[PDB]
Amino acid sequence: PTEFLYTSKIAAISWAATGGRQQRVYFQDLNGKIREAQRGGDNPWTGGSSQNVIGEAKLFSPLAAVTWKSAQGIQIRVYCVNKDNILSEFVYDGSKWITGQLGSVGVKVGSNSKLAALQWGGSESAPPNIRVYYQKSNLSGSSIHEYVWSGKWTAGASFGSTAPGTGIGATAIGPGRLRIYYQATDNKIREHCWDSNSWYVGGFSASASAGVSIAAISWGSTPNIRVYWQKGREELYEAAYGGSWNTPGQIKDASRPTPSLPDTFIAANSSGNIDISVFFQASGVSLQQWQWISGKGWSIGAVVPTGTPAGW
Amino acid sequence: PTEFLYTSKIAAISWAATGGRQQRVYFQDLNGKIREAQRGGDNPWTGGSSQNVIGEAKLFSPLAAVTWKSAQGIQIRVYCVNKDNILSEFVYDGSKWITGQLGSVGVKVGSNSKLAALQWGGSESAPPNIRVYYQKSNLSGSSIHEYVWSGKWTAGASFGSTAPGTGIGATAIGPGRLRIYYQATDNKIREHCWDSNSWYVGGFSASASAGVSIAAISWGSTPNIRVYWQKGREELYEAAYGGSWNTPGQIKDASRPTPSLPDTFIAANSSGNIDISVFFQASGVSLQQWQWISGKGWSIGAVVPTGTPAGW
Ligand SMILES: C[C@@H]1O[C@@H](O)[C@@H](O)[C@H](O)[C@@H]1O
Ligand SMILES: C[C@@H]1O[C@@H](O)[C@@H](O)[C@H](O)[C@@H]1O
Ligand SMILES: C[C@@H]1O[C@@H](O)[C@@H](O)[C@H](O)[C@@H]1O
Ligand SMILES: C[C@@H]1O[C@H](O)[C@@H](O)[C@H](O)[C@@H]1O
Ligand SMILES: C[C@@H]1O[C@H](O)[C@@H](O)[C@H](O)[C@@H]1O
Ligand SMILES: C[C@@H]1O[C@H](O)[C@@H](O)[C@H](O)[C@@H]1O
Ligand SMILES: C[C@@H]1O[C@H](O)[C@@H](O)[C@H](O)[C@@H]1O
Ligand SMILES: C[C@@H]1O[C@H](O)[C@@H](O)[C@H](O)[C@@H]1O
Ligand SMILES: C[C@@H]1O[C@H](O)[C@@H](O)[C@H](O)[C@@H]1O
Ligand SMILES: C[C@@H]1O[C@H](O)[C@@H](O)[C@H](O)[C@@H]1O
Structure with missing residues (x-):
């Protein structure tokens, strides 16, 4: 056994670095703490223990x-929900983990809401633009809401009509160019887009099992988009855009069918051109991943440590 | 969601009482506490909350x-293992929960060992005779060991050669007449017997999936034995003895196939003539039970509460 909370949600980030790509993955432990695990290049995963707590939710x-x-x-922002269902934020400010300013706004979320976030523009010489996506209601047909950071937090848009507690994927495919993926009331994955001055319904859609967990990434100038969804104990799916949308396909290992546990979640990260990780929760209870190795294909990578309870 | 620890083990007891059957079920929460839930007759289950903690393990x-x-x-004894893999006991002494004497003995238990216990003889006018079954090693081919209460704790027998971390069911089919069920290295459920002065290999055996959780009950003068096994996300099996063994069969609901989650455990109780519950862990994470209802048959009964975390 491990200290990984069964049906914990997962979040993941990645950036390229001279010694190998840096990854961080966030997950919840049995005590409600949010832990971080870390990877540098292809070196074994570190972290994931009680000594790697960044916050609580x-x-x-x-x-x-x-x-x-x-x-x-390195700036990191981790979005979560406190015990009063207030949207909250933990900040890695380049040196330490602290509580961010978002919590003080007092944004109320639906108890079963999922979360997604994206960022563009932040650099050494430019401020970040953050968007956080959440829902206020657990009911079927509810909208997705957006919180906006540009120098301060303000309410953004609301759009869509979703499956109850829909998964949400969010990616900035270019500067101020946003794509949000969610499950509609008919269980289709749908796409909401912002290019310049308005939200509009994108051309992407795909039938999926009710209650899939959804992630989305993008890279490059093409741009390239990947949208992932998975129902626990079913196989992972990927839709790919590089100018057109393909027919979605399963990512799977014939020797290890349907490795995720029921009612679990996924997260994705990416960097370079291109390395991708898609994290999932399996027997163990383990934090696993699919990895795309750029010229080899998909495979299940090294298991991410998530602590070992006393007596084991 | 609930506070029921995913892949928690379960233990259950039942007795006849005026007003109807009394049941108690024990399970672990996310904080490692052992909680109790209660049922009287066919009224709703009660308990299972943070206010129903009886011990910790x-x-x-x-x-x-x-x-x-x-x-x-009413006397209750709950057996578990502490964080140093020492066999430990919680006592309900007719009015309150306290720590029992067994822990002071220092009986070391394999980290992945299961536990079973039986009792006979205890009454308003006679002392209990308790037997606890456990393993010292995780490895395939290990024996089952026995601890004995006869007014004090002493080491009892060891027997068998088991699947690694086998399930164990234990039942007193008559006064001082014991039947122990476990999974052997060939994955057959097998039976060890004590009638008078020695342990011997019983006639019962049955093929089963690798790594099943096992429970056993008995009643009456015939006597009647029921042995249960289940691999998580497969159906429950029952073998039945009423003087001879039947062909084991599934207990299942065609409208709710394989309701248990992977890698989970069962427990069984019985009392009267005859009431039986077989507990299992399902999505929720929920504590469920199969119920044997005379003249109706098997069905999934009312859900047992196991807490609701803050924010839900
Ligand atoms: C980019 C901003 O950084 C800090 O000021 C945080 O307190 C804000 O909530 C936001 O994340
Ligand atoms: C990048 C593309 O932008 C619009 O054309 C959408 O309709 C597509 O689905 C895609 O997101
Ligand atoms: C009550 C019966 O006792 C012995 O005959 C065993 O061999 C049987 O399997 C059964 O347990
Ligand atoms: C960017 C920082 O990397 C360091 O290695 C980690 O210890 C911090 O938690 C954070 O992820
Ligand atoms: C990129 C756009 O920025 C704006 O401030 C928001 O109001 C829109 O919803 C969108 O996020
Ligand atoms: C990066 C790789 O892109 C390819 O075209 C896709 O087929 C793969 O699944 C993966 O997303
Ligand atoms: C026998 C006792 O029943 C009481 O109602 C319960 O509160 C105790 O925990 C115990 O199970
Ligand atoms: C029968 C005995 O009752 C006592 O209270 C316990 O302390 C012993 O361990 C044992 O269970
Ligand atoms: C009923 C028998 O009681 C004895 O004391 C023990 O030594 C045996 O193993 C068995 O439990
Ligand atoms: C008590 C009941 O006995 C019958 O003989 C069996 O068929 C049922 O499964 C159940 O155990």
């Missing part, structure tokens, strides 16, 4: 994370 | 329980 809190580089180092 | 501790009536009320 309500048990079974949704999670989302973004990162950028600033003049003060 | 290592996370993912195995569990077993026995009960009898005494002059000072």
